[PDB]
């Protein structure tokens with residue numbers, strides 16, 4: 022096939038040194054089993070102040086006051102809105118606001134786009150690349166709403182102390198400055214391992230090898246919300262008839278994230294109809310709270 026690109030990646034470009042030792046790809050999972058596996062083995066938590074070197078004087082007082090779980094959520098109904106241009110002229114704005122909590126990505130604005138993407142922002146998941154390279158992040162007031170979470174690609178299952186020395190993007194200083202400016206706004210840092218714990222499951226069930234790069238923010242977001250909501254609506258992750266190669270706002274596929282396989286997994290767990298995906302690009306997945314495992 023054309024997956025030679027992946028194997029080529031392993032022989033001389035394994036940037037994250039991924040060494041998958043789990044059940045070879047292709048493991049068949051019923052919907053409920055996959056849901057439990059995802060629930061028990063993808064530990065979605067934030068870096069705590071007891072995690073060295075965040076327990077040192079340099080990081081003293083900089084991490085959020087209260088625990089992530091005992092502050093954010095839970096909620097009954099939630100929505101995950103991708104930044105896909107497929108949302109332009111979707112009119113999903115209303116529907117989207119009709120949820121308890123909403124999670125958006127990076128700099129996705131709501132101003133002037135409400136009718137399509139909604140006007141609410143409960144949680145905001147951002148890449149370390151954004152917070153590091155975007156000066157507007159320290160000024161634009163859109164980052165002031167809701168809760169913020171930033172994540173940074175790390176070496177395969179690297180320990181926090183190990184990751185900390187070799188961050189993909191060094192965003193620590195910018196993270197600090199922001200905290201001072203907005204001391205009351207909860208701003209967490211995803212644990213370095215959670216992306217890889219999720220990656221491991223995606224690989225476990227995929228037909229074959231997947232890109233040795235972490236899951237996209239989209240996939241991480243869907244996961245985060247599943248541990249916080251009873252129900253989760255995902256808009257335009259699984260593309261609709263309005264599929265396009267740009268964001269709904271002027272700054273979009275790639276060859277980094279194992280996007281294809283993340284999509285197949287969400288499709289497997291989708292409780293919605295094919296029509297709603299085609300017309301609305303809407304998928305509905307159950308959260309973890311009430312499942313039996």
Ligand SMILES: *[C@@H]1O[C@H](CO)[C@@H](O)[C@H](O)[C@H]1NC(C)=O
Pocket residue numbers: 064066067069212
């Ligand atoms: C998940 O991460 C948190 C934060 O470090 C940790 O305290 C908890 O025990 C972890 N859960 C598992 C099962 O590894």
Ligand SMILES: *[C@@H]1O[C@H](CO)[C@@H](O)[C@H](O)[C@H]1NC(C)=O
Pocket residue numbers: 071072073076077
């Ligand atoms: C922080 O944690 C590390 C390892 O867990 C420990 O060795 C160090 O002394 C701790 N710092 C303080 C002052 O608690």
